Each structure stands twice: as C-alpha cells, then as structure tokens.
Amino acid sequence: AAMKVYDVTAPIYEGMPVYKNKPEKQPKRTTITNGYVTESRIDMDVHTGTHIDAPLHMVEGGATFETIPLNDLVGPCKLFDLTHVNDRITKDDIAHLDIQEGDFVLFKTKNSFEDAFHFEFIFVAEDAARYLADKQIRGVGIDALGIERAQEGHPTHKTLFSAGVIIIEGLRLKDVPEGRYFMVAAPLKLVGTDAAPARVLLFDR
Amino acid sequence: AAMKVYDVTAPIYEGMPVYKNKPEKQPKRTTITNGYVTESRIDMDVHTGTHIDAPLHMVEGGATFETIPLNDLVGPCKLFDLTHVNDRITKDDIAHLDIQEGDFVLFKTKNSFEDAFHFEFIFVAEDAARYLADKQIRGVGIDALGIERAQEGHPTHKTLFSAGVIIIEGLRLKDVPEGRYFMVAAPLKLVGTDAAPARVLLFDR
Ligand SMILES: [Zn+2]
Ligand SMILES: [Zn+2]
Numbered sequence: 001a002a003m004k005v006y007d008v009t010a011p012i013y014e015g016m017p018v019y020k021n022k023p024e025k026q027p028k029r030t031t032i033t034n035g036y037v038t039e040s041r042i043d044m045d046v047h048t049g050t051h052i053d054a055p056l057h058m059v060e061g062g063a064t065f066e067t068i069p070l071n072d073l074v075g076p077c078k079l080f081d082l083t084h085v086n087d088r089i090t091k092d093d094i095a096h097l098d099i100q101e102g103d104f105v106l107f108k109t110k111n112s113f114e115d116a117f118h119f120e121f122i123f124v125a126e127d128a129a130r131y132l133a134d135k136q137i138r139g140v141g142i143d144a145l146g147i148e149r150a151q152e153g154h155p156t157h158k159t160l161f162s163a164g165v166i167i168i169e170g171l172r173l174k175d176v177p178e179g180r181y182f183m184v185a186a187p188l189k190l191v192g193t194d195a196a197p198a199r200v201l202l203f204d205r
Numbered sequence: 206a207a208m209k210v211y212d213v214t215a216p217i218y219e220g221m222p223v224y225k226n227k228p229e230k231q232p233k234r235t236t237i238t239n240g241y242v243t244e245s246r247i248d249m250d251v252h253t254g255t256h257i258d259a260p261l262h263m264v265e266g267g268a269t270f271e272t273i274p275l276n277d278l279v280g281p282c283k284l285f286d287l288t289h290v291n292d293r294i295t296k297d298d299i300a301h302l303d304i305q306e307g308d309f310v311l312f313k314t315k316n317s318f319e320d321a322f323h324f325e326f327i328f329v330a331e332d333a334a335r336y337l338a339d340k341q342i343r344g345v346g347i348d349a350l351g352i353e354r355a356q357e358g359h360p361t362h363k364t365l366f367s368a369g370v371i372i373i374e375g376l377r378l379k380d381v382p383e384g385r386y387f388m389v390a391a392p393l394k395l396v397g398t399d400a401a402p403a404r405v406l407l408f409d410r
Contacts, residue, residue, distance in 0.1 A: 005279060011270050013396040029398070036359070042395055043248040049394070056243055066216065074210055074406070154241070186391035186404040189254070191218040193234065194245050199391035199404065201279070 006176045006202045010049040017117040018048070019145050046195040047145070050170040052187050057194040058157040065193040072138050072166055073185040077104035079202070081178040085109060087120070088150075091127035099132070104139035104166075104183060108173040111143040123148050129156040133163035141168035141185075141200075168200065176202060211386075211407040213377050215254035222322040223253070224350045251400045254350075255375035257392050258400045260366040268397030277343040277371060278390040282309040284407070286383040290314055292325070293355075296332040304337070309344035309371075309388065313378040316349040328354050334361040338368035346373035346390075346405075373405065381407060 010016070018025035027044040047057070052073070055063035078098070085093055089107060099105055109122035121144035124132075132140060140147070140160065147169050148156035160167060168185060181202035190196045215221070223230035232249035252258070259273045283304070290298055294312060304310055314327040326349035329337075334353075337345060345352070345365065352374055353361040365372060373390060387410035392401040 005275075007275060009394045011272060011394050011396050013268060013270070029395075038251070038400060040251045040398065040400070041248060042251060042393070042398075044246060046245045046247060058241055058243075060241060060243075062243075070210065070212055070406075184389050184391065184406065186389060186406060188247075188393060188402055189212075189214050189216045189404060190234075190247065191216050193247070194236075194243050197393060199394055201275075201389065201391065 004204045008050070008171050008173055008176060008200050008202060009198070010170055010172050012044065012049050012197070016049065017115070017145070019117065020119065021117055044197065046190070046193055046197065047169070048197055050172065050198055050200055051168070051195050052185065052198045053167040053169060053195045054193060055161045058154050059161060062161070065196050066189070066191045068166060072104070073183070073187070075104070075182065077106055077139070077181055077183040077202070079106040079108060079173065079176060079178055079181060082107050082109050083113070085122060088123050088125045089128050090125050091131045094128055095131060099135055099137060101136045103137045104141070105132070105137055106141040106171065106173065107143065108176070108178070109143055112172055112174040117145065121146070121149065124156055126151055126155045126159065129159040133159050133165060136163065137165060139166040139168065141171050143171045143173045145170050168198065171200060181205070209409050211381050213255070213381065213407055214403070214405045215375050215377055217249065217254050217402070221254065222320070222350070223250070224322065225324070226322055249402065251395070251398055251402065253402050255377070255403055255405055256373070256400060257390065257403050258372045258374065260369055260371070261399050264397055264399050270396055272394050272396055273392050273399070273401060277309060278388070278392070280309070280388065282311055282344070282386050282388040284311040284313060284378065284381060284383060284386060287312050287314050288318070290327055293328050293330045294333050295330050296336045299333055300336060304340060304342065306341045308342045309346070310342060311346040311376060311378065312348065313381065313383070314348055316347070317377060317379040322350065326351070326354065328352060329361055331356055331360045331364070334364050338364045338370060341368055342370055344371040344373065346376050348376040348378045350375050373403070376405065384409070386410065
C-alpha cells in the first residue's frame with residue numbers, strides 16, 4: 001500500500017528507564033486544580049529518553065541547542081542492522097557498510113530489544129566514531145540512552161562534536177526494518193540548552 | 206522542484222510570551238556542571254508555546270503507556286490566510302472555504318504578526334467552532350496561545366472536543382503561504398497527558 005511511518009521514540013513517564021538507574025534522572029509531572037482548565041507541568045532531564053545532543057553537553061562554552069539546524073534533522077537517513085554485535089560497535093563492524101559524507105546513520109542494536117536500562121549497553125566505540133567523523137557524516141543515532149561508556153574522557157562524543165556530527169540517543173528501533181528512510185527528528189525548540197527531548201519519526205517515503 | 210520545510214513553532218525560554226503574561230506560566234531551566242559535562246532540566250507548562258490539546262478520550266483511563274496519537278498530527282493539511290479578520294473568526298469568515306470531513310486546517314491570522322502576548326487575540330468563535338466540529342474535521346490549528354477567549358464556559362473547546370477534533374495552539378505562521386502542506390506535528394511523548402508541547406513542521410511536499 002502507501003507510506004509507513006514509524007515512531008522511534010521512547011515514552012516519558014515517572015519510573016521510566018533512566019541513565020544508570022539514577023532516581024534523580026526521573027521526570028516529574030505536577031498538577032493543580034481549582035476550577036475549569038487543566039494546569040500541569042513536566043519537569044525533566046533534557047537527556048531523558050529519546051533526545052538530541054547539543055555540543056554544550058560535553059564542551060565547556062560549547063554550541064547550544066537552537067544552534068542545531070533543523071535542516072540536518074530532516075531528510076534521508078540510513079538504518080543499519082547491528083544486532084549481532086556484542087559489547088560495542090567497532091570500526092571493523094561498520095567499515096564495510098555504505099556510509100558517506102552527509103549521511104545520517106542510525107544503528108539498531110541489542111539495545112532496542114531491551115526495555116530496562118542495562119549498564120553494558122551496546123555503544124559506539126572510539127575507532128568507529130573516528131571513522132565516522134573522518135567520513136564526515138552529518139548525523140549519528142543510537143538506541144541506548146548514551147552513545148558512549150567505558151571510555152575515559154568521553155572521546156566518542158568529542159570526536160563527533162569536533163567534526164560537526166549530530167548525535168541522537170535513546171532511539172527505539174526494534175520494529176523498523178533495516179534500510180533507507182526519510183527522518184523527521186523533531187525536538188522541543190529549546191533555547192540555550194545541552195540537548196532536547198525529541199520526537200523522532202521515520203517515513204519509508 | 207526541491208522540498209521546503211517551514212518551522213512553525215515558537216522557541217521556549219524564560220521570559221517568553223505566555224498566556225496572559227502570568228509568571229507562573231514561564232518555563233525554568235536549571236543546570237549542573239561537572240568538569241566538561243553539562244546537564245540540564247527543563248520545568249515547563251504542558252501548554253507552553255506551540256502545543257497540542259487533544260480530547261481527553263484519546264488518553265484513556267489511567268496513564269497506561271498512552272500518549273496523544275499521531276494519526277492525524279502527521280499528514281496533509283490546509284492553511285488559510287485569514288489575516289484580514291478582525292477580533293475573531295466566525296462561521297461567515299470560513300463557510301465558503303474548502304474545508305472537509307477529515308481535514309486538518311490551520312488559520313494564519315493577525316496573531317502571526319505579533320511576537321508578544323496580546324489579550325485581544327484573534328480567536329475561533331463558538332459558531333465557527335460548531336461549524337467545524339459538525340463538519341468532523343480531524344484538527345484545527347491557530348496562531349495564538351489560545352484558540353478561545355471571551356466565551357464563558359469555553360464552548361469552542363467543548364464543541365471541538367466532543368467531535369474528536371485536535372487543537373494546536375501557538376503556531377507561528379507569519380512566513381507561510383496559503384496552501385496545502387504535509388504537516389508533522391510532533392508532541393513530547395509524555396504518557397497520560399491530553400496536552401503537550403510540540404514541534405510543528407510544514408513541508409510543501
Ligand atoms: Zn549523551
Ligand atoms: Zn487549549
């Protein structure tokens with residue numbers, strides 16, 4: 001038939017999976033009645049769930065969220081199946097793939113098949129980040145709450161920030177077949193922030 | 206040829222326009238810094254800036270993991286130039302327009318040309334709302350923070366919601382020409398709320 005749209009965003013609620021299970025990282029909803037009209041507020045970490053990372057996050061004085069051009073967050077992307085991988089995605093895991101200057105690449109891993117936080121999530125290794133940066137992709141997305149662990153200094157993030165790559169974290173990709181999509185990765189229009197929650201959709205156009 | 210995306214969303218920051226200028230309505234960012242690392246929370250009204258308000262039956266009996274559904278927030282819409290209207294849009298302002306069952310319609314008015322909150326915003330009046338509800342459109346968007354004022358009991362919202370219409374408020378339509386668009390109205394995926402901030406994009410597709 002016609003166009004399929006996939007929503008690859010994690011739902012936000014108190015008790016959701018958060019980073020290292022830290023209970024300070026949980027969102028809080030608050031209400032207030034008196035008469036006729038909802039009130040309600042949401043208090044949340046900007047690195048909650050599915051979200052897009054501003055350079056400010058790992059860089060002092062670093063580039064800030066509204067600085068991300070929408071026009072990179074909208075357009076063709078490639079989704080690769082890396083679910084057979086263990087521990088982490090290396091250079092040698094991705095070097096044979098069709099990845100090029102300008103591409104937005106998304107990596108489905110084992111992470112998408114887990115619903116709670118796991119400390120040993122599949123991440124993007126330093127060698128792989130370098131290879132990607134040197135290739136000059138425009139964007140990379142992963143399906144863990146963070147794109148790096150176990151790497152003193154957070155080199156993966158910085159390799160990628162230095163080379164102008166956008167990072168999307170927290171994606172949920174279990175239901176999406178490998179291949180090409182048109183992506184709309186649509187964040188809250190936060191000004192001056194280290195990241196933002198994003199509602200991400202993939203269209204098979 | 207060549208696709209244009211129009212961002213029609215207001216930015217979110219402390220000091221931004223909010224309904225009736227009430228300070229309670231402002232968002233607050235709070236930050237902590239740990240060396241190289243910088244991490245933020247955002248505390249905001251779910252009705253901040255550009256936002257969706259959906260009929261209560263769409264988020265259905267508890268929280269569940271239920272969120273405002275996207276079937277109608279993502280797809281074709283009609284945008285109408287009603288910048289000639291004064292005070293309020295009435296039945297007679299829109300009855301001749303090409304509006305049909307299932308449509309999502311967006312109204313560009315004088316509000317688009319004001320950046321601050323104005324108390325006497327152009328709104329949708331009862332009679333126009335009833336016309337649309339009875340027509341069984343799927344959605345209506347307006348470019349003030351509220352779609353209604355000066356109507357005791359909120360008959361505008363009431364009648365739209367009975368008919369299952371979704372409302373978008375806080376659009377920014379100044380730069381967008383009358384016509385047809387593919388809309389992606391992408392809300393924060395907050396479980397169990399009938400309203401949420403959103404990032405709204407129009408493609409000329
Ligand atoms: Zn991160
Ligand atoms: Zn409303």
